[model samples]
Target chain A: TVTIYDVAREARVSMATVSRVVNGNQNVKAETKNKVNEVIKRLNYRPNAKTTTVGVIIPDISNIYYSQLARGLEDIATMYKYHSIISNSDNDPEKEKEIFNNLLSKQVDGIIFLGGTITEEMKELINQSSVPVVVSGTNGKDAHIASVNIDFTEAAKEITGELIEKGAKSFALVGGEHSKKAQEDVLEGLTEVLNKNGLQLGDTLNCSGAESYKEGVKAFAKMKGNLPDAILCISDEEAIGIMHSAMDAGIKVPEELQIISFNNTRLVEMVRPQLSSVIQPLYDIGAVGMRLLTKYMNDEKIEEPNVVLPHRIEYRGTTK
Target chain B: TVTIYDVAREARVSMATVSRVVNGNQNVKAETKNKVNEVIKRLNYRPNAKTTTVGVIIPDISNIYYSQLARGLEDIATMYKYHSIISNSDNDPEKEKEIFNNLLSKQVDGIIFLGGTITEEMKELINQSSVPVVVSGTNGKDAHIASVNIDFTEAAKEITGELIEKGAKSFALVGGEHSKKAQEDVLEGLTEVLNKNGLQLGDTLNCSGAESYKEGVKAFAKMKGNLPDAILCISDEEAIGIMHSAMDAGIKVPEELQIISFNNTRLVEMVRPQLSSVIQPLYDIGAVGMRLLTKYMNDEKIEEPNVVLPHRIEYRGTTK
Candidate 1:
């Protein structure tokens, strides 16, 4: 309930001087700083977080990939002494816009957007906004916003290459809405590798409904007779589901079929034949995105707007 | 950046009238409301969310159980036209206090706490807070704050009874941080059923600390030779992990070992022999908690501070 004005009034100093003291700006005189500190301690004054909050807009919180990324963002936000507000837009553009506007009105110091379809209106809002904005795990050709993400193309290439080396000549890709830019990039990455190896991508395997374990099982069942030599899943959940379905159908993994997946979630370890995955540095992606936002907020120079973290193939029991 | 005063100035009316119109309060003239609305539209005025935002504090977002609960909270918040800011305190008391203070200063309309060890200071803060406080998924003996959670005693009783009816003579329990009340309740629930059947619980059978799938696997490996006929896990992740380890050690599930788990996460379906778990209405718990908070915020009458949703045993391949 005690504001900076109350602290200033109690300290018998101007509000500007109190602000300077609270922000640790060295422009204030030592006597005035001490007086402000005394009043601050006595009145238990705290700066209003309304002016220092950041917003992280995620597609789905239940997704391990986004939540891990959220952990990274939380770490950096705490380090910078900023409160981070998170919201799940459910990948709906209308909801995303509404959440974006709400955070904007809260006067957030910055924003870190997880992967979602960016609308033109959203692009315009970001371009016109005065506050620093960083998009995490998303990149569009015309997007002016800064971002931090994995090099999906290279990681995908490496994962697909590994599977090919293990004697997989055909592949089926399972993932979420492929229209999404990140999903497309991953597919593109896999295709690039497959094409170079004189192989072609077979039928795409994707769950129609929500990206859940049940849906993954249904997708695998739908592709029973036409199973590819190797499966590249966009998510570990899907990979696990496919693995279970394969086992139920009496298919031996790595011998009869090879599987590689993305997002090294806990499911990868829980399956019978442990799934091989591309270890996306989710924490680093989130941390670096927030750090970039801070840098932009502080008016520091940025080498590049797009920052890519390291990712590699982590082979386990699922692959040969 | 346009304030109500700017809208009033443009509409040739007093700021009070504009405020009433913005808040949908009565006693504002229709013509005045129309003029104010037009000016607001022209200026693209958006209300500051700090004045009406809500805060959601949870243990970890990466946990599917809590994250699903968070998603339910988000849905309810959006329905009520309030933005929910989330934070993960990692079950640390100090971090919880810090997050609580930060959210308080941000002037959240309400606070929904999903996890954390509450202390006297936190209790005092919640007691003195003008905003409504609703605790989710945890039970505190505070009459002032409302909570919505499952009847862990009853759910655990049913799960254990099912396992017992399936001809299980011995039992082991896996959990995390046994000092917590929920963990204690699960043990007590299992004990209530086991004691009635004249079964003895050994100290070695009570295994804990399976926070991750890998940890769960390691814990099961440690209990390989002295494994019980049935295992009760606090979480599906731990159950899946134990199942994975058992299968790796050539221990067939449901036949050689029966497993029952809680938190019907997607991992339950992905395991080879699908896991049998207690399906808690996670979304309902969160939605009901938020609905209770809304009632408290509106100063409406509340029938009960505590609400327990339905829970049932889901039979899959893990249990006969």
Candidate 2:
């Protein structure tokens, strides 16, 4: 069992130099890091050292939004050689707590929440976590924790309000349970703006997805004989489904029916009418959030512990 | 700091009982696990003992396939009180090695690959890992290691054979780089089936996706002047993209053009024409794979070292 002391002595360097290389600090010269690892491998050294690592809890990574964001998170971590322990919370507060404690047990320097439902139990756990935690893509205000996210409320208000100002009437909200902060906030913005314009929501089309097509189709079917003037889908996939259902039912998009989706996934343009959406900076939020966690782990500067990435609307065929 | 002994003594249980509860093993009665955690919380106990954890390396979790699969993996892991340390490989070979080395330092109990390119270096590393390894969805042919996947080749053959029997003359294979076993095996199956049917593939469209629809559309445009009788997209998103493009060109799906997608993702029905697809039990693959690895770690019997889950073709609107 070779030791770091042997590597430091063999490399003709201080114990700290061997430690730096082993820990993979970005400051270590690339050549030095590579050589040290080579020696470690050659010596078949098992570094009993706990991982200098970060744990990331994401809602879903397969969602291109999170996938892109996670890539950014992954890329930055590797650049510094900090291994990441990524987990899927799947929106369960109970599961989230277990994962958080589990990460701490792994001795991660910090944890990054790329996205998930941050329930009260989770907030308590996050507040109590010994290791630093950074939240991204979730409303973490209640937790009083460091976070990064796009302005979901503003994005929602802008998309829905803009459509209304253009003289559209009778609207519907599609997809997801109304309880989630992400879903609830968007609805709030839509509600406030619609109320101001002397309009009440036409329908709350109960639906949930990535399985949006089925839900969207079912939502459409539920209102087949009675339709709203405009429909705001929670996602591009759902919007596509709503858009297709309208087309199939002989309703002309924008002419007789208008659609918009929040979350501008690439699924937007893949539809025939195309999809107009509130484009959230999916990648930036995760990248910046991960970077922020690294800051805490390294005991670096203190700044806007809460990061709010900007978002905007990308109008396309669905809006007409 | 309150110790495990303190909690165990207070809870009137063995230190091992307190530790098991603290570690979050699913086997513990829910009432007991909750009670122990509550006591630990009340005592303000912070355990620094290392976790008995599993390292999960996945390409992407935001993808529905991986996301659902991860939930299953996460669920089972929690049940056994096994902490999971997940890392995103992002299909990069070098980064994969870095992640592997990092997890090794954590001394994780076992590792699971949800999906990846599984390059030779990865194979070598998998071969050398002192910790047991399990590969899911990705290629793991050479290492003769534990793996779980659907037979991609068999699925492709069944799909293409069925299509040919339905009087198809020409076809195309659309999706990922041929370097991937998942992509290549499907191609081989398509080629073999086509040869037997006296029908040759028309176009080999290059594509990869999460926003497979974008690639699907791009692939369709590349086929500007030429078109196949039916197209087999590697992913549902790609199939939807092609479906959208076909509709854009006024090509009626299943009338003037026919299409099929491989993965039975939600993207299939999100399209207007819907999509015919090969349904791979994605969640089952990862869940079963993780469960299999757990068996190995516990010295539990494994009837099969490599698990090949069953797959089937789902006929939908895209096919005649």
Candidate 3:
């Protein structure tokens, strides 16, 4: 394995000179820097940036959506030759804060924050961070920090409109905590579209407190007595759970109830009546977030700190 | 931002002594080590192992199956206070070798090889690595290295038998490269079940290729004119792709054709006539892999370096 010492030995320079040249520090003399750089190129002596790591903060790893997003972030980090240290906060605000402080103490180069419980202290810490910081899948619309996301309102509205066009009249919404900004936006978007179409929104169909398949099943059970003609779920996993509960109850989908969901995750394609979902550019969102953070770290001019990628409804078996 | 110098000054010891203590070297006297350790704890000075790193080699990060597995590996690495650097090998033998050498040059503390094209040279490298090496998602039977995976043959047989008992006589199989050991096991398992029932297997219906939604579509396209009563796909993505193609071709599912898939991914629930798939316990697979890797690294008594997780057929809209 070639190291800075090997490059220095080959270039007839000290390891300090080699480090200065590799880091692009202008403190070194021009001729010496060039000689060290030439040897580096020939020997392919890559600088070890173990001291400057980047942290990827995610809510959950089991969720295909977050895992895929992490993959994109990892790819970009690999491209820029940055070491990424990932931590799963499991959506806990306190844990997220602790991880943030830990990463800072480790002297990470930057941070890519995925969805989590964001607090005032976290926002302040991000603002005060000397290192770069980029937010992904969060609610704040701050220009000071760069972020990448899809328009949740528009995505929800479009998916709801598709369901309505498929002869769905009365509607129910299933999602995460309504207090969550993203969850609220989805419901708001659906209501906006329903109002525009002169349709009345039916009773709220809360899919329990759980976010997994069990929650979806519980939500379906709650809606059994007064089921709506159509349902909009916040996540594909919830939608799948709903489908399972509906099946268990012998209620045929599309004929008895129509459903649409968000996050065109793997579940969207895996289930029967393949769920009709809004395809958020998950990979692009992560890639763009990392790219933005890199720019911020380099102190480069960013054209837009906030980038909203495209979201569209993909028709499958679930709807007309 | 406090460095070793600050801790040394506070402890009244040389920076070299502090460094030796931090590295857990026996060269440091017990008294001096205790003093440095006390100051480190008091000042909360964290030693950055910027010199140590690890490489994560995976087949494809974009694939949900692989990504989920990567998350488990990342969790284990983070727990051990190591930074994981990942690279997508894309199942290319040359690319895997190139990445191995590249990671070696970076002086990664260890390498975790996920599903990929493993060559002789790669095996030799793993054998020669001085650092801890653990392979995940690879066949461990008769191999000298440690790995974790589920019993593909048994899972395939169970799912296939369930579909057969549903009154389907004819069958078609869509899968990845038959040359791969895992793919071969799945087919063998299906064949064993059918042969035991005195069912004559028709010309094995499938297009030769790898696993993906696109591949699924292509494989189904090849079976357009000769559709079977039931189709078994190697993955949920392929099954969904085949379903989509069937819909495009105006073929009814479950009613006219029954489809079963592996991986029981979220895609199964998203589609209409939800797919019935064999659940492979992905989370458990990952969790178990990490546990095994940890045990191997710790030189603990591993009851079994390789474990076969349980699998069950989940009935949905794809089957009666």
Candidate 4:
């Protein structure tokens, strides 16, 4: 069995260089990393090393919104030659704790938390852990955990203003139950716009669990009797579901009822009268979050621990 | 700083039992396994053990089709106390080799290959691999690797027959390029139906890469001039894409042009004139595949090596 020392000596490099290449430290020069790995492979060197694996705890992998975010993180993980140990927490607090402990038991190099609320206990656990963690696609809520996110408040404000400009008065907000901070941010912006326009919210449909199409369709039943002039949704799944139900109820979108959703996915185009949505950097959120985690794992200097990406509303057939 | 032997001694169990519990072998009695883990945890035993990780190499994680499959696999992995190291091969052969080699280097206990063609060279590599490998949602193509899949040929025959019965004289087949065997199976079933009905295929649209909505939209450019009476698509993405493009061109679905697709994803319902699709057990395929891999990894009894799940057609507005 060839040792790291043997490989380093044979490659005319330091043992640290061999370890850096093996650990996938991006700080290593490309040429040096490639040559070191080549030598390691040629020597059949196996180190008693920590597996270069990053654990990604996400809400749900089936939902395109979260999965799309996972893709960006996984892509970045691959680029750094790191294997991503992905687990779906389903946003359940208990399950999240178990999954976190499991990852820690595996001695993962780092962890990336996505699409879930960072509770105070979770923040303490993450802070106390020896390994670093990064949160993506959701706010850290002053937990001091490094995160990548879009300004949901600003996005809500802008999209609501668009709806207001389009002559929408009564409003309904559709969102999932996870992070109070996120829901609050959306509410603040929406209320800010409504107050300015002298309008008011008709209703707010909050999905008890995962914001799903089924929940969205069920939301229609609650608001069917007294329909709002415009609806704002937190996720595309709920938005499409609500839109389909509205169409079924003989409401002509954009003409009779204006609607806009967050998380612009390909589903927007597939639907009839195409869904209008806020295009957040879903992929970038995951990518930047993972990149930030890598920085922490490698003990690199951190710049901008909490990254806030840009967001904008994409006007489509759902709204004028 | 406790050793496995120390934990085993304290728990009054054999080292084998301790190892079995640590490795997640299902044969170990549940109570004993839990007790052993509890002892290990109480002692803070950190075994310099092979990480009980399974590498999942998939096409694109963002695509709902593949992501849904991944969800099933990951859920089962969590149940078995295993971490899934996921990667996106993008169905590229070279990338697959690199990803495979990397997973092997990480010393993953097993691997799950999904949504990619297994070439002869790859088969040889897999055969030579020390760790167990399971192919999911794709046929093994006589490579002798254990696999889980739906009978695409039978599905195609049934769907094509339905289209023929719907008074569709001219037909078109839409698919992605990857497994020649899968394509051939579909073609065989389709041709059999067409020959029986004395109807000829107008065109066959095959995406050069991953079957996608963008490629499906491009397929419309090829079929718009001389549209087929019915289109048989291999994926919901392409089906919705072609449907949207056709509707864009003033073509009325189900009345003038009927379309049926495989993969009964949520996208089918989101579109106007909801798509008719063949419902393959996407989640079950991944779930069963992972379950089978666990059996292999644990060296348990092999009841059925190659498992083929059933598939059926779901009629919607796309078919009259």
Candidate 5:
């Protein structure tokens, strides 16, 4: 089951070019055609539309953030006249591989691993399947997989740097456990930006068991006495928790403390002083991620293995 | 496709009575067994499995509310050793039926519709399916659909009545475009409770949405000039919007403008004065719906065709 992607990669041609050679299109140059055909012969590759469904393995389906990603992937799959079977990984690295193998056995045309830490085992599974694989919003940092996302470290730096410029002396970073890669990237970005500005993160709280607001409240209550001048929360939920505790403790936002959060989700404006956050086009990340997968699946040109979308900070009451 | 429910209604008996006769339960009296058998014979009833797959059609899977419900449904289906084929309807009534047909064609054991308004067309679609169909968290009133739910109208009335007792006079009820039946039920509950107390609904906004946090912001800005003393939001998403509006306008919550929301999602406590909402056991609704469906699929007693779970008000910061 050497796929069109394999042929394209070996022949140093785009999937679209490989498709041209396979479908007997004359658009391919003679030399490139020879190379593609030789690779096809070597790999014994034959292009066929055998894929009826795309197997979407999402890390955590219960999280609203990931659901948005799935919605995007589903719509794109449908647009390409393909159906999908999404399996929830439940954050088990072991279960993650099983779901991949399961989807492949279902004979899906391709795979979209949305929102997860891409383990080497999955990379092994990805190779075992004769299909194209793409990840969305994983940031795919230092990974060989094709992915679509905002530059996580950059977004983190941008959000935190704004607070740093606002005369904030110290910083605390809060996030979840499931997304280790995301947390790592954001932390790295925050650390880089802070160090360059002659400062460092005061506290780092990875409230994995409870990324809920209550967790954020407890995180703040325990640290508020020795609190940072500002905090960069990995999510709005945690940021909201900090805001709540700050208000409860009569620590006026922006005056005594400033905060920035990620994923300007619906919870942003729900707070008293609405959370300032990094605007991530989550739905688009999912859509583009799937769209990229469709390309590789169909022997189309992939301009870049890793696609990074633009991001910006939305200023609100939480920041001065 | 003629179901136990259709037969029980024709025979004017409970489904449990019908099951007792079928399964040889000694509790059924001789006369009742005869009547149940006569109806079963009239409908030419035959029970069968082969429904290994459960079709789960939910609208807006990205919304946390529906995600929790789906999680519940999937875990139960898995526990009972059943597989599921979940499809996102995206609020299209027509696509919903198509998924239903597709799943039935796949020979799903039952169907779990987690969202969408139960239109007559949908009811007709349910009638055509050869397996049991259960609606979870859908307040499908006046429709003889086997469903699991917390009393939407009753919860709405109880919540509204409390605000009224707290001296809230001018009232507004807000909801999204999806879940028309839910929005209708909430509206009905609010109106009935208000009229009984010699007050009435002031502003009704069905933000059928683009109702994200930004949508809520727009909803607030546009509607702020003509504001109410209190608001009953159908979901936590919209209530946060009105709260954003009140805070932005320098209007104090509970003190100046009291507000309450439905669905005690994690977002509830994240707000400044945490939202007071009816405790809808979303997970249980999904689990119970599947449990009920298994009973119908098997020859087990269905105590009730429709099951209403309990609802309670969580008095939080928003209420005085």
Candidate 6:
């Protein structure tokens, strides 16, 4: 019942000043802040007073990559005065469908689908429905689905090239067991780099569908007997796992084994020899995807249905 | 309007069988699976067809500790056929109040308040509200707010005693700068341990309220001149930051400066020599708290209003 407009009117301040006070901005004078606070307490106003709801269906909230991406979407959604209801899909196709339908049932204004594959059946469902859908991080190629992403293949190739130039003779690929679109892109780029250098992949290790740190830690056992000089992991978690295993076995990183991974999150810095990774613009992808969804929901002009941001390789302690 | 009941009736199977088929349980017979799936398609059934909604208020979803806890809550909520709306408060008390009011506005059946200091105003609000509320991971002492937690003070005392027994002469505590209830508990326990051993804390590093990895990385510079022999960190992220900084500076862990932290999430294992930590049932706290909320929402009698879960200190490479 209480609105920012009501607070502004009652406090005799502008709407922006009322918003600034509620959002903890210190730019306002003490008198203005006290007046806004007085009105806010009296009116019982809520800052997140959005009736427009957007659904963010993510793979897993526990994963740093997805969580940060969700954070970006949430921050933007809050900025635009929209409330986001984020649900975990676990990257299961059936679960994604279930959550999508649930969001529809809740009458969410728009949906920002993150990470999971976009199937043909799902594409038809989205096309038939009036709800605007935007996919983030995962490419919905040829599905006519609005999406946001980074050039995963080029990122993989660039990092792989960095390792090769540093005298890495053999390479390994460590990724998720499900082999999603991102994994394929990483593999394709890695293959291209190996082909250019007259070399081939030495080993490929796939973790469980979850691709968690534990799965990454277990990957060491699979490649212990036959190790590669360098490895391109799909995610930072797996890379840290392999790196820890290598270090535990008395192998020096960048000397005996070099490593690179994707989704350059803070996890890269937490490890001993910090992980070198491809910066995927994870947060930007989520934020841009949410913004795109707002456009579709508001019936705004559409320029780029499929948006691809930039990517780069950050060489850290794991590389030469 | 299609329900699991309709599918089961059309397929000539039990509702449980229909649910199993929909949930991807392989135990169903091939014939039953096909029959149920055919009916599901014809009826266009959705798995999450719940009208009940609950709200989960958290500090930060990107933080591993909170994310994993949220996963537990989400999993249990899904199982109970209740959809949850998770919102991040960023540990800003004002922001927390805003989210709380917004959730109330959304008409959430119950609210699970996680990981923030319960101020008097908040306690009063919770007490005055008829909606069932459950507090997780943070102690809501004497507030008459139903809560689930592990005794932070005791957990800290136990871990500190271990360090004292192992001959850690000087000690430091690295925690969030905001100084919430958890941080106070840790400090109190640590002080008690020091008092018993005729020693005191050497340095206190209060990271910006976020207590992020970057903060931990920066902490080494502050203590590099007068480093302590033992350090007690509040979260695994901070522990890894300090550990990485120490290792980068050529100081050996456990041998030169031992460390122990709380919330033994997968992060502890990601680092080299791994981190020694105190195991607080992070997932169980979320799951149990949600379950408690459900019971209260359904008007079920609660035997114990405030639940205190068990805690233990796990000795790893960080401890002698």
Measured on C-alpha atoms, candidate 2 has an lDDT of 0.69
Ten-residue stretch with the least lDDT total in model 2 chain B: B206-215
lDDT of 3 at A41: 88
**lDDT digits (tens) for residues B1-320 of candidate 3:** 34555677799974435655764555467898989899899888763324335567776654655665565455444545655556666555665666777666556656667665456777787777665666655432326666655677887788778777788777777765322445567789989998989775655544332366766666777878877778877667778788877877888877778888765554565566677887655544544555665565556787876666656577888786
- Stretches of candidate 4 off by over 4 Å are A1-52, A79-82, A104-107, A140-142, A178-181, A195-198, B1-54, B79-83, B101-108, B139-142, B178-182, B196-198
Off by over 4 Å in 1: A1-52, A162-169, A195-198, A203-210, B1-52, B162-170, B177-179, B195-198, B204-210, B221-226
* Local accuracy of candidate 6 as per-residue lDDT tens digits, B240-259: 88888888899998899998
**Across residues A78-152, which tens digit of lDDT does each residue of candidate 3 receive?**
557665656666555665776777667657789887765467777888778797888866654334667777788
Q: Could you estimate the TM-score for every candidate? A: 0.77, 0.76, 0.66, 0.78, 0.76, 0.80
Candidates 1 and 4 compared by TM-score, better number: 4
User: Highest DockQ: which candidate?
Assistant: 6
- Least well predicted 10-residue stretch by lDDT in candidate 1 chain B: B202-211
The per-residue C-alpha lDDT of model 3 at residue B257 equals: 82
TM-score of model 4's chain A: 0.81
Q: For residues A179-271, what per-residue lDDT tens digits would candidate 5 score against the true structure? A: 556677888998998889888578788754325566678789879779889888776777788888888889999899898877556566556
Looking at model 6, how many pairs of residues clash? 0
| TM-score for candidate 5, residues paired by index | 0.76
Q: Where's the lowest-lDDT run of ten residues in candidate 5 chain A?
A: A45-54
Per-residue lDDT tens digits for candidate 4, residues A1-320, read 34444666678875445655765555567888888888877877643214487888887777777776676566566667776667777676776877788778767789988777776777778878988988865544436778777788898888888777778889988887543445678889999988987898877776655566766887888899999999888778888888889988899887998878876666777777888887765545655676688788879978889888766566889897
Q: For residues A220-309, could you state the per-residue lDDT of candidate 6 as single tens digits?
A: 778888888888887788788788878889889879988888866778767767788876655457656766787788799779888878
Native interface contact recovery, all models = 0.80, 0.62, 0.22, 0.71, 0.56, 0.69
Of 3 and 6, the candidate ahead on lDDT is 6
Instruction: Please write out the lDDT profile of model 1 over residues A54-144, one tens digit for every residue.
Output: 8888877877777766865675566567777788886667777888887887677788888776778778777888878888655453366
